[PDB]
Write a protein that holds these residues in place. Structure first.
Motif, PDB file in Angstrom:
ATOM      1  N   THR A   7     -23.373  50.117  22.797  1.00  0.00           N
ATOM      2  CA  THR A   7     -24.718  49.583  22.826  1.00  0.00           C
ATOM      3  C   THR A   7     -24.663  48.269  23.579  1.00  0.00           C
ATOM      4  OG1 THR A   7     -24.524  48.362  20.738  1.00  0.00           O
ATOM      5  CG2 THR A   7     -25.229  50.664  20.604  1.00  0.00           C
ATOM      6  N   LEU A   8     -25.809  47.628  23.744  1.00  0.00           N
ATOM      7  CA  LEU A   8     -25.880  46.357  24.459  1.00  0.00           C
ATOM      8  C   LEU A   8     -25.181  45.220  23.733  1.00  0.00           C
ATOM      9  CD1 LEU A   8     -29.546  46.144  25.775  1.00  0.00           C
ATOM     10  CD2 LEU A   8     -27.533  46.770  27.064  1.00  0.00           C
ATOM     11  N   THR A   9     -24.874  45.424  22.459  1.00  0.00           N
ATOM     12  CA  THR A   9     -24.196  44.402  21.675  1.00  0.00           C
ATOM     13  C   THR A   9     -22.688  44.615  21.582  1.00  0.00           C
ATOM     14  OG1 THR A   9     -24.625  45.616  19.620  1.00  0.00           O
ATOM     15  CG2 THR A   9     -26.234  43.950  20.279  1.00  0.00           C
ATOM     16  N   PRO A  37     -35.250  53.816  20.754  1.00  0.00           N
ATOM     17  CA  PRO A  37     -36.093  54.799  21.437  1.00  0.00           C
ATOM     18  C   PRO A  37     -35.448  55.301  22.722  1.00  0.00           C
ATOM     19  CG  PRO A  37     -37.426  53.057  20.593  1.00  0.00           C
ATOM     20  CD  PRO A  37     -36.001  52.576  20.503  1.00  0.00           C
ATOM     21  N   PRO A  38     -35.475  56.618  22.958  1.00  0.00           N
ATOM     22  CA  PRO A  38     -34.897  57.238  24.147  1.00  0.00           C
ATOM     23  C   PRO A  38     -35.405  56.627  25.445  1.00  0.00           C
ATOM     24  CG  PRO A  38     -35.382  58.905  22.609  1.00  0.00           C
ATOM     25  CD  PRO A  38     -36.062  57.639  22.096  1.00  0.00           C
ATOM     26  N   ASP A  39     -36.697  56.329  25.525  1.00  0.00           N
ATOM     27  CA  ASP A  39     -37.246  55.778  26.760  1.00  0.00           C
ATOM     28  C   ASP A  39     -36.741  54.373  27.081  1.00  0.00           C
ATOM     29  OD1 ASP A  39     -38.475  54.858  24.512  1.00  0.00           O
ATOM     30  OD2 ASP A  39     -40.513  55.377  25.114  1.00  0.00           O
ATOM     31  N   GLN A  40     -36.064  53.743  26.128  1.00  0.00           N
ATOM     32  CA  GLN A  40     -35.511  52.409  26.355  1.00  0.00           C
ATOM     33  C   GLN A  40     -34.000  52.496  26.477  1.00  0.00           C
ATOM     34  OE1 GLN A  40     -39.001  51.570  26.906  1.00  0.00           O
ATOM     35  NE2 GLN A  40     -37.413  50.038  27.312  1.00  0.00           N
ATOM     36  N   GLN A  41     -33.496  53.721  26.462  1.00  0.00           N
ATOM     37  CA  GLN A  41     -32.074  53.950  26.590  1.00  0.00           C
ATOM     38  C   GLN A  41     -31.690  54.228  28.026  1.00  0.00           C
ATOM     39  OE1 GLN A  41     -30.143  56.751  23.908  1.00  0.00           O
ATOM     40  NE2 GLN A  41     -31.771  56.467  22.388  1.00  0.00           N
ATOM     41  N   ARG A  42     -30.694  53.514  28.523  1.00  0.00           N
ATOM     42  CA  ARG A  42     -30.222  53.764  29.873  1.00  0.00           C
ATOM     43  C   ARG A  42     -28.723  53.947  29.762  1.00  0.00           C
ATOM     44  NH1 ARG A  42     -31.152  49.872  34.625  1.00  0.00           N
ATOM     45  NH2 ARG A  42     -30.413  51.674  35.837  1.00  0.00           N
ATOM     46  N   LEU A  43     -28.233  55.127  30.116  1.00  0.00           N
ATOM     47  CA  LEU A  43     -26.807  55.370  29.996  1.00  0.00           C
ATOM     48  C   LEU A  43     -26.085  55.369  31.326  1.00  0.00           C
ATOM     49  CD1 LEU A  43     -26.815  58.207  27.324  1.00  0.00           C
ATOM     50  CD2 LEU A  43     -25.860  55.914  27.034  1.00  0.00           C
ATOM     51  N   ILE A  44     -24.903  54.768  31.318  1.00  0.00           N
ATOM     52  CA  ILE A  44     -24.063  54.685  32.500  1.00  0.00           C
ATOM     53  C   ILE A  44     -22.686  55.201  32.109  1.00  0.00           C
ATOM     54  CG2 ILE A  44     -25.265  52.917  33.831  1.00  0.00           C
ATOM     55  CD1 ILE A  44     -22.752  51.123  32.521  1.00  0.00           C
ATOM     56  N   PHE A  45     -22.032  55.873  33.041  1.00  0.00           N
ATOM     57  CA  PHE A  45     -20.692  56.395  32.836  1.00  0.00           C
ATOM     58  C   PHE A  45     -19.910  56.259  34.112  1.00  0.00           C
ATOM     59  CE2 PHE A  45     -17.664  60.007  33.141  1.00  0.00           C
ATOM     60  CZ  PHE A  45     -16.761  59.534  32.215  1.00  0.00           C
ATOM     61  N   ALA A  46     -18.861  55.447  34.048  1.00  0.00           N
ATOM     62  CA  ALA A  46     -18.008  55.195  35.192  1.00  0.00           C
ATOM     63  C   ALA A  46     -18.836  54.768  36.401  1.00  0.00           C
ATOM     64  CB  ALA A  46     -17.185  56.444  35.516  1.00  0.00           C
ATOM     65  N   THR A  66     -16.210  57.047  27.438  1.00  0.00           N
ATOM     66  CA  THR A  66     -17.085  56.001  26.910  1.00  0.00           C
ATOM     67  C   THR A  66     -18.335  55.795  27.757  1.00  0.00           C
ATOM     68  OG1 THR A  66     -15.283  54.775  25.830  1.00  0.00           O
ATOM     69  CG2 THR A  66     -17.285  53.544  26.401  1.00  0.00           C
ATOM     70  N   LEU A  67     -19.505  55.834  27.129  1.00  0.00           N
ATOM     71  CA  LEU A  67     -20.745  55.604  27.857  1.00  0.00           C
ATOM     72  C   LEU A  67     -21.302  54.233  27.474  1.00  0.00           C
ATOM     73  CD1 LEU A  67     -22.554  59.081  27.490  1.00  0.00           C
ATOM     74  CD2 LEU A  67     -20.584  58.471  28.886  1.00  0.00           C
ATOM     75  N   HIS A  68     -22.066  53.624  28.372  1.00  0.00           N
ATOM     76  CA  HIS A  68     -22.665  52.315  28.116  1.00  0.00           C
ATOM     77  C   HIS A  68     -24.187  52.325  28.147  1.00  0.00           C
ATOM     78  CE1 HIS A  68     -18.576  51.485  29.627  1.00  0.00           C
ATOM     79  NE2 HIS A  68     -18.592  50.455  28.800  1.00  0.00           N
ATOM     80  N   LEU A  69     -24.803  51.661  27.179  1.00  0.00           N
ATOM     81  CA  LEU A  69     -26.248  51.525  27.176  1.00  0.00           C
ATOM     82  C   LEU A  69     -26.522  50.259  27.958  1.00  0.00           C
ATOM     83  CD1 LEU A  69     -27.551  52.532  23.614  1.00  0.00           C
ATOM     84  CD2 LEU A  69     -28.231  53.506  25.833  1.00  0.00           C
ATOM     85  N   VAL A  70     -27.470  50.323  28.887  1.00  0.00           N
ATOM     86  CA  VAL A  70     -27.817  49.168  29.718  1.00  0.00           C
ATOM     87  C   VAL A  70     -29.323  48.963  29.809  1.00  0.00           C
ATOM     88  CG1 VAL A  70     -25.720  49.254  31.135  1.00  0.00           C
ATOM     89  CG2 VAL A  70     -27.748  50.573  31.803  1.00  0.00           C
TER      90      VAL A  70
END
Ligand SMILES: [Zn+2]
Ligand SMILES: [Zn+2]
Length: 70
Positions: A7-9, A37-46, A66-70
């Motif tokens: 998560t962002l934290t 909320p899904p609409d505020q979720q942004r996932l990044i991978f590598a 590992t995925l990152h929320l941004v």
């Protein structure tokens, strides 16, 4: 398969998922864990921005990834 989402934290959530799961599916799982909320979720991978209609396998997301929320 098991993947991790940061998560962002810096908090780490564990997810049990399948190779054909979509980012949208994952996004749904994250919502349940943290209430984010899904609409505020942004996932990044590598360094790759992940699209809702694509699958984990589409991004070569493997066990222990590992995925990152941004
Ligand atoms: Zn598994
Ligand atoms: Zn699934």
């Amino acid at each position: 398969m098991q993947i991790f989402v940061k998560t962002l934290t810096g908090k780490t959530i564990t997810l049990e998922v399948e190779p054909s799961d979509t980012i949208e599916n994952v996004k749904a799982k994250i919502q349940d864990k943290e209430g984010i909320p899904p609409d505020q979720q942004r996932l990044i991978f590598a360094g790759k921005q992940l699209e809702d209609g694509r699958t984990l396998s589409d991004y070569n997301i493997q066990k222990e990834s590992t995925l990152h929320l941004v």
